[PDB]
Design a protein around this ligand. Structure first.
Ligand SMILES: Nc1ncnc2c1ncn2[C@@H]1O[C@H](COP(=O)(O)OP(=O)(O)O)[C@@H](O)[C@H]1O
Ligand SMILES: Nc1ncnc2c1ncn2[C@@H]1O[C@H](COP(=O)(O)OP(=O)(O)O)[C@@H](O)[C@H]1O
Ligand SMILES: Nc1ncnc2c1ncn2[C@@H]1O[C@H](COP(=O)(O)O)[C@@H](O)[C@H]1O
Ligand SMILES: Nc1ncnc2c1ncn2[C@@H]1O[C@H](COP(=O)(O)O)[C@@H](O)[C@H]1O
Ligand SMILES: [Mn+2]
Ligand SMILES: [Mn+2]
Ligand SMILES: [Mn+2]
Ligand SMILES: [Mn+2]
Lengths: 565, 555
């Protein structure tokens, strides 16, 4: 059959996705054991492995199509008929939204991400928003405080599958009660109850219980991060009940969660209540469905673009000397394209830059580096581009632009969450907002360093400030691993004094970072360590000794050991 | 008064320089014992840079101390400091380097600096401290080798001393026959030669018929026990271990010239410069190599010519017909295809110079203002020089000056070799070509433009990469599968399937490649290598045929 081939391909693609998501779940399933045996280097390798799964299976499916069709995998009318058959397979399939993403990826491979039209692939979903039926398996369990909250929480902690001893179980329970009472007041507390997700959300050294705390006045997040003693005993480090704290825990600058989710769209829907600020793409990316989040983000971009009456402009701030960065005035994302030629001092390849972006992508981002989404042959309407930006694009990125009459195609760019560059933020805020910004800036350095990321060019212009006031690094092309750096004490005179590649003089940092009397004093007060090579070496040594530094996705004040010790 | 102060400042600088050279070298044992392989790598980078640092310091000292006859008197005072001085040959090199910095490598004459040595050669004298120890088999060879192995200073336990000893006995017996073995002994150098993950015992195997190399490479278990991976007793094998395409050895040598002399008996093919460069005296090797060049030039009766093979589109390459080196100068303008800087090219040569060359990349010696006699230059080459390298040439009447060039050991370009060699020799060449790729890939070097014309074949048949300006790190590359039936490219993209067009177009060669190196056309193979690199693993590299490993030829 000519029609058999069309169906064989459609079933091949869908089979690939069946397997891909099955392997995604199998890797994720192993998060508990990795946590239980504190194999923190297995945890990090698992995040890289799971990140690579989708592209692998897309690749396999494409080579299968290549060998099966013997040429027609490039025929477009053929693959438009495959798409019709594939579309008709989706109404019964549970993960249909991601099945469309997987087909999209296969299509884009076949045609080098060219010729993307709404008829040839699922730029938009082919299925209605008719998915709110009662979930085949409950994804959460209700817990009411019929016998009070002490032995409510003592069942919840009891039902956890974790196979380790608790350091002091009821101590932690009382901590949680203190927080809940101080927050709701005893009367309302006894009226409210929990609905907690049945799967734990794992990240690095933490196992997060994620619930909804439903109260008279409304429903709130309920997050308990579970950590491990150096010995191997479990404790709950805190309790977060604000949407703001939850937004940060599920933040774009953190590694994705490892959470066993056979129906991700259902888990995504359930999370909306406690994450009302997140787009659908952001929620999918928070539970690890990164590639589907890409699909959803291009849709979010299209929605915004068509309803905005603004043009693309260069992003405000200090112009990059390797990246060209533009945005839409009201849009929450930036577009970053690598320049054709970098400043004449700078001897590095565009490929190095791309490699640094991939390094960040599969690293523990530790709440301090933004997630990026790489796009190839991104298409823009000429009419949507500021004349200022269009002139810039053709000066600096000409080799990456091709004309298509009323449109252009950018060969390669990254999409990143938009922030306020810190060099602008520090000119905008005073007193306490300014203190908190410098605290966060220095903490950004420290946490990246302890995670074996040396930021390289640490100037304020290379950090961004989020909606919740957090400082996040985004200039990735001078990153190196901490272990690759040679920290030295005496700064060179500023010829005959020997300095070799990889030499860093933290004492030199104070010249840039304390030049402004509004800022220096504050940096000195809180981050003087950052000017001592011995401090950096200490972090370097702990890293070489295999140690992995704890990271708290919330203020240190909120730790039970702190606010109640 | 200054003239003597200057001579003493320079000589003092060298005293410190070589002292710091030994101290970096001193730490090779501990680095090996604790398998700190990235410490090994950085110590090689550090030690390579030591000399230029100390020259820089001395030059800044001389500058702050603020004629032509003047510096002939500085040189005369310096010369008078040398007759007792033990490492005088390198002291002369160090003076030469200080002079060249002060004078931007201009006006180099035999009177103004030590183009040739000021002292009579001293290989006559008895070494003040023995550098090697004799070992006779009075109680047989089983407990001879257990004496040397026990006497080693290495502080680790052995996987199986007695096995490794038996292994070595098999080799010696199979090589000499039980009779010649009995009237034979070892003279083994007292310092181990450290390189990457190996500690080499280096000896002389003295037989009735003559003297032979005796090399035992000492390796480490993944857990940390010592074993001897083999025993090499041919000069050819020794020449390869000390080859121009391998990293220098780290070997404690208080009298480097004495060690060079001792090394001559084994390794009889190497120039003096090559022996100095094999034990890490890279800058002094440059001095000795310009002397070797001058010697050859005066006795040759031929002119400089463009080097045989495919003309380079970024480098211009010439040589002397009977000479063992090529000169490579960066072109003024590159072919319109290649979008790159002279600075990129210089950077890639610098990458290779301080990289573990892993036996697959040639060492280069950079020269500034290299002076040639016009009468020595072929009219063909002279036209090429002025067409392609005009900005780098200045006229000085009867001579020209090349601003910048690299000198490299000369080989037969592989595209020529493959037209010369057949059957088994041809199989061996393609085996080596693919292994050069593989070994470079595992060392995080992506060769870039891997066509045969960019590799050379050595005197001993080994394939060595020499086109450095398209090198990049494996970790910087994005290996991709080709979309079916053109398609274009994002930064770093490489399509290993495309290799087949170029590398298998010839029916004499392609088939042999598929047989032995089909992996190299599969994106999965390269991606696998990429990951092993990122997951921190460092690939073993054996400076000898895999067959010769004891675990293989005896297990
Ligand atoms: N996530 C972001 N949000 C807002 N602005 C950004 C973001 N990333 C980059 N920019 C802006 O683009 C510029 C260049 O970004 P950067 O990644 O630092 O490129 P380069 O390496 O060329 O300096 C910055 O100075 C800043 O103005
Ligand atoms: N070590 C060498 N031995 C012999 N010939 C060489 C050597 N290095 C370069 N060549 C010759 O010079 C040419 C250009 O060398 P290469 O380094 O590849 O320059 P390019 O980068 O311009 O290709 C080669 O095609 C070959 O003929
Ligand atoms: N240039 C592009 N324009 C719009 N969508 C794209 C583009 N490239 C990839 N995508 C979408 O991103 C998702 C993942 O693609 P890929 O990264 O190719 O696996 C799919 O939904 C694709 O259709
Ligand atoms: N252009 C040159 N011609 C001849 N010899 C040189 C040249 N440049 C450097 N040398 C020699 O190379 C050795 C090291 O020099 P340098 O690279 O300047 O440290 C010294 O013996 C120098 O005399
Ligand atoms: Mn920047
Ligand atoms: Mn940058
Ligand atoms: Mn070449
Ligand atoms: Mn080249």
């Amino acid at each position: 059959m000519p029609r058999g081939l069309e169906l064989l391909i459609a079933q091949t693609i869908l089979q690939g996705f069946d397997a891909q998501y099955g392997r995604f779940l199998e890797v994720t399933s192993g998060a508990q054991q990795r946590f239980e045996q504190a194999d923190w280097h297995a945890v990090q390798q698992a995040m890289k492995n799971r990140i690579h799964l989708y592209d692998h299976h897309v690749g396999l499916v494409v080579e299968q199509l290549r060998c099966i069709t013997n040429g027609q995998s490039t025929d477009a009318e053929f693959l438009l008929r495959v798409k019709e058959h594939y579309t008709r397979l989706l109404p019964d399939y549970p993960r249909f939204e991601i099945a469309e993403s997987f087909f999209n990826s296969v299509y884009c491979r076949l045609f080098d991400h060219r010729s993307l039209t709404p008829e040839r692939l699922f730029i938009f979903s082919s299925q209605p928003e008719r998915r709110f039926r009662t979930i085949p398996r409950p994804l959460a369990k209700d817990f009411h405080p019929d016998h009070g909250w002490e032995s409510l929480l003592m069942r919840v902690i009891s039902d956890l599958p974790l196979r380790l001893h608790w350091q002091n179980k009821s101590r932690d329970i009382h901590y949680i009660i203190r927080h809940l009472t101080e927050t709701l007041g005893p009367e309302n507390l006894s009226k409210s109850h929990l609905q907690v997700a049945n799967e734990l959300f794992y990240r690095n050294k933490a196992a997060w219980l994620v619930g909804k705390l439903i109260t008279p006045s409304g429903t709130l997040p309920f997050l308990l991060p579970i950590h491990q003693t150096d010995d191997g005993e479990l404790f709950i480090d805190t309790c977060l009940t604000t949407t703001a704290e939850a937004s940060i825990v599920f933040g774009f600058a953190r590694s994705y969660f490892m959470v066993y989710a056979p129906l991700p769209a259902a888990l995504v829907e359930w999370l909306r209540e406690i994450l009302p600020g997140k787009t659908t793409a952001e929620l999918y990316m928070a539970i690890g469905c990164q590639k589907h989040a890409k699909t959803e983000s291009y849709r979010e971009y299209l929605v915004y673009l068509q309803g905005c009456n603004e043009q693309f402009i260069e992003a405000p701030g200090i112009r990059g000397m390797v990246m060209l960065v533009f945005t839409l005035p009201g849009f929450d994302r930036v577009f970053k394209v690598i320049k054709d030629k970098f400043a004449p001092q700078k001897e590095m390849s565009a490929a190095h830059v791309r490699a640094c972006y991939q390094l960040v992508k599969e690293h523990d981002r530790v709440g301090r580096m933004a997630d990026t989404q790489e796009f190839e042959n991104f298409v823009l309407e000429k009419r949507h581009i500021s004349p200022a930006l269009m002139e810039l694009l053709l000066q600096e990125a000409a080799e990456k632009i091709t004309d298509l009459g009323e449109q252009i195609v950018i060969r390669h760019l990254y999409i990143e969450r938009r922030m306020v560059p810190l060099n602008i933020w520090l000119e905008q805020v005073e007193g306490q907002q300014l203190r908190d910004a410098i605290e966060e800036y220095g903490n950004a350095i420290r946490q990246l360093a302890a995670a074996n990321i040396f930021p390289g060019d640490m100037l304020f212009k290379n950090f961004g400030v989020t909606r919740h006031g957090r400082v996040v690094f985004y200039d990735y092309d001078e990153i190196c691993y901490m272990t690759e750096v040679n920290f030295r004490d005496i700064p060179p005179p500023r010829p005959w004094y020997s300095v070799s590649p990889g030499d860093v003089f933290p004492e030199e940092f104070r010249h840039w970072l304390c030049a402004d009397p509004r800022i220096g004093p504050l940096f000195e007060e809180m981050h003087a360590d950052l000017f001592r090579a011995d401090y950096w070496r200490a972090l370097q040594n702990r890293i070489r000794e295999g140690h992995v530094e704890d990271v708290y996705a919330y203020r240190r004040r909120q730790r039970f050991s702190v606010r109640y010790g």
